[PDB]
Amino acid sequence: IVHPDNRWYKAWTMFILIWALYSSFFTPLEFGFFRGLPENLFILDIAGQIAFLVDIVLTFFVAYRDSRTYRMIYKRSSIALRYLKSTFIIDLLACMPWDIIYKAAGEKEEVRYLLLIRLYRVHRVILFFHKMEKDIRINYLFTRIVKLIFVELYCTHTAACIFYYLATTLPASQEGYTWIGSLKLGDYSYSKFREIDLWTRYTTSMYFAVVTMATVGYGDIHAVNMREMIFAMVYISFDMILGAYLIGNMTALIVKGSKTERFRDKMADIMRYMNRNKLGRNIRGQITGHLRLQYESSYTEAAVLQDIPVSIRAKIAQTLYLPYIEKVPLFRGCSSEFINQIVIRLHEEFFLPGEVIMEQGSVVDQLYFVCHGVLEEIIVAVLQPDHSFGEISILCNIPQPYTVRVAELCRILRLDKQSFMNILEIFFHDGRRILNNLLERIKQLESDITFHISKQEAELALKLNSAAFYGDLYQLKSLIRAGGDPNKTDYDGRSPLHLAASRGYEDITLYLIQESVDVNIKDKLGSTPLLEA
Amino acid sequence: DIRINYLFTRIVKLIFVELYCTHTAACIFYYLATTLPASQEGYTWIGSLKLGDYSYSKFREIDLWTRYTTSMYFAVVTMATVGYGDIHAVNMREMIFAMVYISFDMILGAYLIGNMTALIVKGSKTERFRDKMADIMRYMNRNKLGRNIRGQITGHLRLQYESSYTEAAVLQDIPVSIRAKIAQTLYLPYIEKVPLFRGCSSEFINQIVIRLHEEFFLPGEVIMEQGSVQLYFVCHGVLEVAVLQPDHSFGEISILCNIPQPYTVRVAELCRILRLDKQSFMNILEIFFHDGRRILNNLLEGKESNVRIKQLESDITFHISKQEAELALKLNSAAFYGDLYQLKSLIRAGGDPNKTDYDGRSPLHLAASRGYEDITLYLIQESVDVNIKDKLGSTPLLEA
Amino acid sequence: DIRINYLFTRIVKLIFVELYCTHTAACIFYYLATTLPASQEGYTWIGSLKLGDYSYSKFREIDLWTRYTTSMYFAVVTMATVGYGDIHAVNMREMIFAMVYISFDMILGAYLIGNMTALIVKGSKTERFRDKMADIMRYMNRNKLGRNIRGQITGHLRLQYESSYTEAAVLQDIPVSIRAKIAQTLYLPYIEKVPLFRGCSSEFINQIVIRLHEEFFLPGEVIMEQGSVVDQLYFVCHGVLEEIIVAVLQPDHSFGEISILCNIPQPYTVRVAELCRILRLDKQSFMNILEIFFHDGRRILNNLLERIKQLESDITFHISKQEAELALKLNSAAFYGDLYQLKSLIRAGGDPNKTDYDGRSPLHLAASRGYEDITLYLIQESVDVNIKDKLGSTPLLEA
């Protein structure tokens, strides 16, 4: 047993597809135009059957496809059960020779009708389109269009061979009552109609079928007798439904949309939005510039990635943004846990050349990491990739001293002020390294950074004491599970038990017992919490 | 009829109508040829017709099946707008009929094309699923990331695709009377055996099963965020610091204790979750005062294996005591007006005769305050303290 | 015009334009045959024409009515793109006109198909109904619902198929303020005729019409069962119902009001006899409205009388107890110092100056527990300070 993915059996399937195309396009030709398949084609007829014969026994080696949803069962009894119950009888009958049998039973025309069973193997070509339709590299709607064209052009080929057969089913003495026997083009007569250099006998028949299939209509070639009118009615009626089916799938391809159609809709809203607000002409040149930027070089296609869950998208950000961040001088030696908390909350933006991101004296509200392109700071400096700018303003609360100018098309990762400080506060140890690395006003910033981390420990103690003083149980609850130690004292020294015992708040006293806060803590006065009660 | 494909039954209906109008037009077109005398056969579409070799000299006694196919052959060629010119109208009465039939077929012919295009454009449910996949796959190769996360992305959207049968259904159209009966046959077994509602009133559980809203969450999704402020029930599967067994409710302590959930809930596998609105639970529990007290009583008893309940025991013990004291407050109110009907129900539903309110009072004091002997012996037979002392030193014998 | 569909009107306009251009092109085409001398009529499309036996030789005195039809017959065949070849252009000036007429009609022909598709793509009643049944059948199969219930859900969906209903998900765009007036226009006349609301105030009744819902029930269905707890109140507006046969329900009546008031389980089974239109009201909404209209609440109980004595006594006892109960709730909030808890029951509750059954102003409890903050709030309401309980004590005596 072999699974249908061996990459060698799969190459065998692509080899039998050539025979399927050949034997499906040649069976109508042999049935209609030929009356015995002369010996020039003897080898090809025999070779075609043995190629399909080795496949009729190799089908048992294939295991299975699926039982209910997905189950490849490799069992001899299971594999053969589906084969003999679905299409084995037809496959065997089609591979059995019929040309030699026709000539071995005298000349019986009724035995040549069995030769049309070979038309079933064209279904193998159709299954190829279905298999290729599930492929994601090529659009499936476009594949469905090609399938309908092949079917329509194959039925035209089959109808041309059948139509010529209806002309040969009358005696040669009555050839004047056939569509081709009585035909007369410009100078040609088509008198004998049976020795007309077949290659110019098939084109005439095919020329009739293509004109009828496209519903053009000339009248130079048309049905005359009763048995050719009936076939024309069923071929025309069948093609009318098939013709309207192609148009339906052609519309569905267009109705999906395009880049130009989506871009044109966005500009309609932006132009309407800017007109009603009377925006300046300079700003209108920037908003319209960014929309054309995303027109070509297709963007992330927003409103689609939002279906992705945040948990999965969290891993996506690490795969993409991590290599660029690690190279910045600011984050040299930082812990991996701290850096990972930054990659999750980053956003990607593009800026055209000549644009301005920051102005001199402006308050910085975002932190930008340069990942692509080049920027020039105003010329007093040049910004290279794997760098960050604006970090001076956001740390020392200094207004931005320099203007950053975009020099070439650049990709920039931005971080908000609120998100940055929340991450920085938790990683207190990492925060000290950032200030130290930035040094390598500098002394004042370094002193402030060391003073900022020193004051925050004392400030949280005051917040807890204030909440305990006013008896707000819920206010102090948030700063206990994710805040500081309630046992600590402020600058003067004031345990929450002292204030609670001074104001006679019995309820808050119970909670402090649960935290096992020490009772005999003394301030810089010699007093005890029991002394206030 | 849902069992029959809609595209199939629209083609057949339109084909039958178009093939029937063609059949009728063929019979009418031959009639216009017989309205002229036999001497003027040469001015008819069929009397002046000569195919390959046949003459159609008289177009009478011509073996009607031979005389009908040629008329039908002309009609179906113009129906499909092919056009041959071997058969065509010659005189006025056939030209006029041809104009009113060709123009009629043009409107009907364009109606078939416009009817089949609309059904092709309006694709099936599975058709729109594959369209969304192409955008994700195309974006996936734009970055060329790893293979481990590709399986999670494909599995996530497929899981919600197959579980969206209850997602925004049309059940709101059904009257609530029918819809209430549906909920009592689906969710009732699960809400009956959850340990939280053990020993609860039958009427209470009927008012809580109606408001359920089932939901399916893919594995790895965040049901709730840690440190953030809807009751949830589990039916099958496992939930994730801790693992939630089936038939166990989480988030009950958060609502009751007014504390945000400290752990983020992440789905370990494909599980069915029934959600109840947080505001709905508070409003529902308010009506059933007797049943609500038994809820946290069962929650308090659970402080044996779970560690979260043990460290929250003090706060929980306050709520039950506060609610129990409120029950005693109503007990004295009922005895004040001497309506013995309410006294029996309250004392039977866990009420105690030796229950004191905040201000030291007891039902015995209210019983003898108004001189109601009917309730006096009821508490005496209930083994109550005759000499119960209040804050102000007013014994039941004193104020009487 | 809104009476007739605009897409269908647009279809008729295109047909008129196409059939008018065909008429104009037929008159122009014959003009191109008369712009040549009579001696050269053999080079024209009609001069050289020869049908079955007719010759069209002179073609200039040919009984015009049979000269226009043969020219219109050419134009209609070309317009529909059929093509016969019996009539066709021959000279140079008729080929050029045929090229511009055929090319112009090709664009116009494809324009008709586009508008024909847009008419179909809008949808239909059958198409929308078929989509709903697909979800319901899928929903019921996965939950393994009983065969009896499946007969009811499918019945209501088919009920709204014909006699088109409100077609919900479109009226939601209407603002609630406007929709409030719509309810008073429709549901108000039906409510006023019920015996229960005889003599009720217009303000009370208006608060009921706003929060009603519309439902339909097929014959043979059951709304209430014996011994069941009633959770909805129904007003009969159309059809006839039979209560089980012990009674018959007529329009402009209400049933189930006994259960919702005395907390008694439903004693009778209500069965639908004919197609009925029913307005329903929830239990929670009904009680909230009734509590505010205390005066109207007494009238409803009195009108219902005309177990009855017990229900009447309970109704009079229910309105008596609620005044005392709200006093206890305020005192409990003041005892535990929950400022926000008592805030909600002051602006939309009872008078804080009132006392409970024993008599205890909230100032007494506040002064007993030493809650300074709550004391400021009571000053804002100007609550009397010298209120005494049935003990001789004062609020200052507890402090």
Numbering used by the authors:
A (entry chain A): 74 to 451, 461 to 522, 529 to 621
B (entry chain B): 208 to 436, 439 to 449, 462 to 621
C (entry chain C): 208 to 451, 461 to 522, 529 to 621
List passages from the publication reporting this PDB structure.
Among these channels, the Stelar K+ outward rectifier channel (SKOR) functions as a K+ efflux channel for long-distance distribution of K+ from roots to the upper parts of the plant. Interestingly, SKOR contains an intracellular ankyrin repeat (ANK) domain, which is absent in all the depolarization-activated K+ channels with known structure. Unlike the canonical potassium channel, SKOR does not adopt a C4 but a C2 symmetry, which occurs in the C-linker, CNBD and ANK domain.
After extensive 3D classification and refinement, two final maps of SKOR (named SKORwt1 and SKORwt2) with global resolutions of 3.1 Å and 3.5 Å were obtained. Interestingly, the overall architectures of both SKORwt1 and SKORwt2 do not adopt canonical C4 symmetry but exhibit a dramatic reduction of symmetry from C4 to C2. As a result of this asymmetry, the inter-CNBD interactions around the channel ring differ considerably. Compared to KAT1, SKORwt1 exhibits a significant rotation in the C-linker and CNBD. Superposition of the structures of the ANKs from SKORwt1 and TRPA1 reveals that repeats 1 and 2 in SKOR are assembled similarly to those in TRPA1, whereas repeats 4, 5 and 6 display a clockwise rotation relative to TRPA1 due to the lack of β-hairpin in repeat 3. The packing of ANKs in SKORwt2 is different from that in SKORwt1. The ANK-induced symmetry reduction may be responsible for this closed state.
